[PDB]
């Protein structure tokens, strides 16, 4: 009868809470009034479209302003000594010298420097003028409108799909593997061959003439002939200059390895062959599940067949087909887990093997990106583990999964939790113990007494990969190894050359300071997983509260009685888990930032010597590289690092409000409000105004979220200001 | 005086007319004194009145 339209219960709430929950309840379909599986799936589908339309519009927006407000064309001509423009600024709040200050580049007013690496992205892909950016902006905007269209389209009763269709998993897998993965990477490879490669060779190929231009001299003869080697006949020379004819070859598909020496990025020929190769594996593999032809696998049959003899895995995977196909949260958990891993995967491979020409020369961009994807990966992981327990509560069928791997999982969960506890306490005690030991020796002027363990195991791996520093002589280090002799005339010359250039990021040199920090990160991993896993497995029931599953995923507590039950819900478990996310990726991003900062600065001996103790982090990382940042203004004058320092403090202030909502809880605030609501009602003149919605204190769960949110935002923004301002 | 200010404040009386007047004529008040662009009144439409400064990586 009032908004929340989707909840009678919340709509009848007389207070301001109705509002808050209404905002908070909006996307939870299963909890709305008179909901069905059909409406659930259909709303989810439409929502996916909605997301896509926002994404395409967002991307088009970037291209739009780079083309309209940027210096894209000044960059292409001189990428090394021009700062890429993101956007113009029109701020009526700025003072006279502010407008002078922010006018960087070739700009006719105040501008901001892009640290997204979209320049080098574009530029490496083939984008040459503002025109190209405009056309792409129009296109993707058109795709946005199309997606919006499509959302409302399959909302009508004629175009409403049936639940059976949504449950056709085999078909979606076949199509996504073959088409979405296979075809689209094949088509990209098409783009690299037809546009990117020629663009790097200095021949501008556009919509109007591609069809008329030969990418290879004897094109499409090798292809059908099976003389594929001709496509790798003459690669670009070692003196090739990117985007110019000088030193350019004709090959379209190679396995060279290493980098394009002047740009220091992967070879677009290697990238072409890569996308093409995977494309084939995807296309062949995408014909694996049974649909409407009779040929193909059964998922159910595969899963149910995989039960080992002598019941060492119980009933194996029997019943998982149904509990997965039914459970949406399960699918989102698997998806988020995989997506989180690959997000960090991307982050860790991109920095050490950059793919873009004249990236990695851009320090700030690289730092910004690598922080970006690791934090995104962290949040995504916590979320994976957050729809973990939502499954465990709402979705699991105890009878239908009897004695399976899943039920057996629940069975020995105390073992799992307790052994994670062991693994985290071990690390926590020893690593901290060895650091603080290292500090005390530093303090007393005896650094020779430090406990510095050399990372022999990683140093071994680097040796097996062909770095020769450590002199183990294994695999790709040793010249008398089959592994060496096999591919020595393939790509190893490009590889080995790149691994041993220590001015690049590829498999950096490692010492005892590396050793400690990785075990700090391991502490990060294991503990966060302890919170999340514990929260997932005890979502259903515990000894304190056996009937927890009757309440659901978020609840304040179960009262003060029998000891006290604050932060008992799996919700709260995930909440607690976010703090470790934050702390852990905080450590990882620092690790990253410094070990590069000292590389770029030209003194890696700063890192190796101060990373072995924590004051070293405090003094040589934090205290040193904020010098310029905090100076952005002083009583004497100003410079260009105004916004970062403003935002630095902004983040800190957000960070401390969070503490407010986290530490102080409801009873104080409500009674505060209780006196205020009397105060209003017997204040004359003001008497004549009264509220419609009774003023009430935010909930516990509300307080829980609002703290967390402020904390995270402050975290991110503060670092971002630091990272960028210092690296720049 | 009560006759001066009954007749004067009787056409704007209605509540529906305020969301039509105050919103659209109020935007017409921002879009007038907002678009009207020199040093005379604010220091941004003034613009940069000196030559560009040198960056950190030998940039323009």
């Amino acid at each position: 009868k009032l908004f929340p339209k989707f909840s009678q219960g919340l709509a009848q709430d007389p207070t301001t809470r109705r509002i808050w929950y209404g905002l908070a309840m909006a996307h939870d379909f299963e909890s709305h009034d008179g909901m069905t599986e059909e409406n659930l799936y259909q709303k989810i589908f439409a929502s996916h479209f909605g997301q896509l339309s926002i994404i395409f519009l967002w991307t088009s927006g970037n291209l739009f302003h780079v083309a309209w407000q940027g210096n894209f064309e000044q960059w292409v001509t001189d990428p090394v000594h021009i700062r890429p423009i993101a956007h113009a600024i029109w701020d009526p709040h700025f003072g006279q010298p502010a407008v002078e200050a922010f006018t960087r580049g070739g700009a006719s007013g105040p501008v901001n420097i892009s640290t997204s690496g979209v320049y080098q992205w574009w530029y490496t892909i083939g984008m040459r003028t503002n025109q190209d950016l405009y056309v792409g902006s129009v296109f993707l905007a058109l795709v946005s409108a199309i997606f919006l269209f499509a959302g409302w389209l399959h909302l009508q009763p004629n175009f409403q799909p049936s639940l059976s269709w949504f449950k056709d998993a085999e078909s979606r897998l076949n199509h996504h593997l073959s088409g979405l993965f296979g075809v689209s990477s094949l088509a990209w490879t098409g783009h690299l061959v037809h546009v990117a490669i020629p663009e790097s060779r200095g021949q501008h190929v556009g919509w109007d003439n591609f069809l008329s231009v030969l990418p290879h001299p004897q094109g499409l003869t090798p292809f059908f002939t099976g003389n594929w080697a001709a496509y790798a006949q003459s690669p670009d020379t070692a003196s090739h200059v990117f985007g110019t004819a000088q030193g350019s070859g004709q090959a379209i598909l190679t396995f060279l390895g290493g980098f394009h020496p002047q740009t220091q990025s992967l070879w677009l020929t290697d990238m072409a062959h890569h996308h093409l190769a995977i494309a084939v594996i995807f296309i062949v593999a995408g014909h694996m599940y049974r649909t409407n032809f009779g040929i193909g696998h059964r998922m159910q049959a595969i899963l149910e067949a995989h039960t080992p003899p002598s019941g060492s895995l119980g009933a194996g995977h029997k019943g998982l087909f149904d509990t997965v196909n039914n459970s949406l949260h399960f699918q989102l958990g698997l998806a988020l887990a995989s997506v989180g891993t690959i997000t960090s995967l991307v982050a860790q491979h991109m920095y050490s093997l950059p793919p873009y020409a004249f990236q990695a020369i851009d320090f700030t961009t690289q730092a910004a990106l690598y922080t970006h994807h690791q934090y995104i990966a962290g949040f995504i992981m916590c979320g994976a583990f957050a729809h973990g327990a939502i499954f465990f509560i709402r979705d699991y069928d105890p009878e239908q999964n009897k004695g399976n791997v899943l039920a057996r999982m629940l069975d020995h969960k105390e073992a799992l939790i307790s052994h994670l506890s062991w693994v985290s306490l071990f690390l926590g005690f020893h690593t901290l113990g060895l650091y603080v030991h290292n500090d005390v020796m530093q303090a007393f002027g005896t650094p020779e007494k430090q406990i510095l363990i050399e990372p022999v195991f990683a140093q071994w791996i680097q040796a097996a990969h062909g770095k020769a520093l450590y002199g183990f002589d294994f695999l790709l280090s040793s010249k008398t190894s089959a592994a060496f002799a096999n591919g020595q005339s393939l790509w190893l010359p490009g590889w080995l050359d790149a691994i041993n250039n220590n001015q690049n990021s590829l498999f950096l040199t490692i010492g005892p300071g590396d050793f400690l920090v990785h075990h700090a990160i391991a502490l990060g991993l294991h503990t966060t997983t302890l919170i999340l896993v514990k929260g997932a497995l005890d979502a259903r029931g515990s000894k304190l509260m056996p009937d927890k599953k009757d309440f659901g995923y978020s609840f304040p507590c179960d009262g003060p009685g029998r000891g006290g039950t604050c932060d008992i819900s799996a919700y709260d478990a995930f909440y607690l888990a976010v703090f470790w996310m934050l702390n852990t990726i905080g450590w990882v991003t620092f690790y990253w930032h410094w070990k590069h900062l000292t590389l770029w600065q030209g003194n890696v001996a700063q890192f190796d010597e101060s990373s072995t103790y924590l004051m070293g982090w405090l003094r040589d990382y934090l205290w040193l590289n904020s010098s310029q940042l905090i100076n952005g203004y002083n009583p004497f004058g100003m410079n260009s690092l105004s916004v970062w320092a403003w935002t630095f403090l902004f983040g800190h202030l957000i960070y401390a409000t969070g503490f407010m909502f986290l530490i102080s809880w409801r009873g104080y605030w409500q009674e505060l409000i209780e006196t205020l609501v009397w105060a209003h009602e017997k204040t004359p003149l003001a008497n004549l105004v009264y509220w419609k919605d009774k003023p009430v204190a935010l909930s516990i769960v509300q307080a829980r979220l609002v703290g967390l949110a402020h904390f995270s935002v402050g975290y991110i923004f503060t670092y971002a200001a630091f990272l960028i301002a210092s690296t720049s | 005086q009560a006759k001066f200010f009954t007749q004067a404040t009787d056409i704007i009386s209605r509540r529906e007319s305020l969301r039509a007047l105050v919103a659209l004529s109020g935007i017409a008040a921002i879009v007038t004194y907002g678009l009207k662009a020199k040093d005379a009144d604010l220091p941004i439409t003034k613009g940069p009145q000196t030559t560009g400064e040198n960056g950190k990586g030998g940039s323009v």
Partner: peptide
């Protein structure tokens, strides 16, 4: 100075002004 003189103060005020207005009426009524 042509475009951003119009679109900045409309996005700054006139979008949140009628958004806070029409969303308030959606909440209370």
């Amino acid at each position: 100075s042509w475009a951003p003189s119009v679109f900045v103060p409309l996005t700054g005020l006139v979008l949140p002004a009628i958004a806070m207005a029409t969303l308030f009426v959606y909440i209370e009524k």
